[PDB]
Amino acid sequence: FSEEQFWEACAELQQPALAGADWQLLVETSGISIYRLLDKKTGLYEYKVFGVLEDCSPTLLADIYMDSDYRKQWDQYVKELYEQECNGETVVYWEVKYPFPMSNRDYVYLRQRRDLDMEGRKIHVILARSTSMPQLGERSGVIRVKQYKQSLAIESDGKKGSKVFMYYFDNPGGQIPSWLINWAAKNGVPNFLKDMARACQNY
Numbered sequence: 001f002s003e004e005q006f007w008e009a010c011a012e013l014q015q016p017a018l019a020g021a022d023w024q025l026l027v028e029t030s031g032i033s034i035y036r037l038l039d040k041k042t043g044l045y046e047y048k049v050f051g052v053l054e055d056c057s058p059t060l061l062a063d064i065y066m067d068s069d070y071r072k073q074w075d076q077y078v079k080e081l082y083e084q085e086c087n088g089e090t091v092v093y094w095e096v097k098y099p100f101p102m103s104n105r106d107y108v109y110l111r112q113r114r115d116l117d118m119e120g121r122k123i124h125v126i127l128a129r130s131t132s133m134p135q136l137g138e139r140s141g142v143i144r145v146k147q148y149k150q151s152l153a154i155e156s157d158g159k160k161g162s163k164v165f166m167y168y169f170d171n172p173g174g175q176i177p178s179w180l181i182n183w184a185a186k187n188g189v190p191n192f193l194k195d196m197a198r199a200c201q202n203y
């Protein structure tokens with residue numbers, strides 16, 4: 001994870017670039033919006049998350065975004081989650097619960113935080129990216145997501161919470177039913193952001 005990449009995760013935090021392509025909104029909740037951009041040739045999507053979360057310190061949100069022990073405790077979709085050091089870098093293992101019949105997806109990835117000061121503005125950036133380890137091969141029954149990259153930026157909203165900007169992408173290695181995106185858009189994520197807000201109140 002280079003310097004530049006961290007800097008790059010701050011751009012849309014101030015100003016949302018979405019005009020270059022067909023980003024369509026998909027969700028608005030708790031003052032958070034999710035845009036998605038379909039890659040017509042692969043059926044694959046990219047997501048962008050903007051918004052605010054009052055009632056949750058930028059600095060809280062960051063620490064919690066990093067706390068696996070805690071995440072395992074409050075996040076209902078985590079089936080398994082743990083960290084190990086490999087070389088000098090932290091490697092995260094995360095298995096996500098999928099609505100059966102669908103098999104869960106699990107991730108092996110590098111995750112790194114950096115609290116920045118961009119012109120006196122104190123921001124928090126976390127980038128994630130896929131990696132592989134010979135000791136951690138694929139598990140039968142679970143779908144290993146081999147392509148995954150994410151970035152997230154947290155600034156205060158000046159008031160009680162924090163404004164964020166998240167960029168997301170992975171190849172779930174199998175079709176994702178529209179119904180699941182519909183459950184996700186309309187109930188899944190809305191309820192998540194809530195438990196998370198609430199999990200932030202009880203740190």
Ligand SMILES: CCCCC/C=C\C/C=C\CCCCCCCC(=O)OC[C@H](COP(=O)([O-])OCC[N+](C)(C)C)OC(=O)CCCCCCC/C=C\C/C=C\CCCCC
Pocket residue numbers: 026027032034047049061077094096097098099107152154164165166168176180181184185188189190192193
């Ligand atoms: C809004 C419209 C919905 C769009 C469709 C989304 C998903 C459809 C595909 C599969 C859904 C199956 C059910 C899974 C439960 C989803 C409920 C939820 O809502 O699960 C939050 C969570 C954020 O994962 P994570 O970033 O915490 O770490 C993630 C690390 N690993 C990637 C390794 C897991 O979703 C995930 O993993 C799944 C990957 C999708 C993430 C893309 C949008 C992000 C949605 C919510 C996050 C937005 C704001 C909160 C984030 C912090 C605020 C600064």
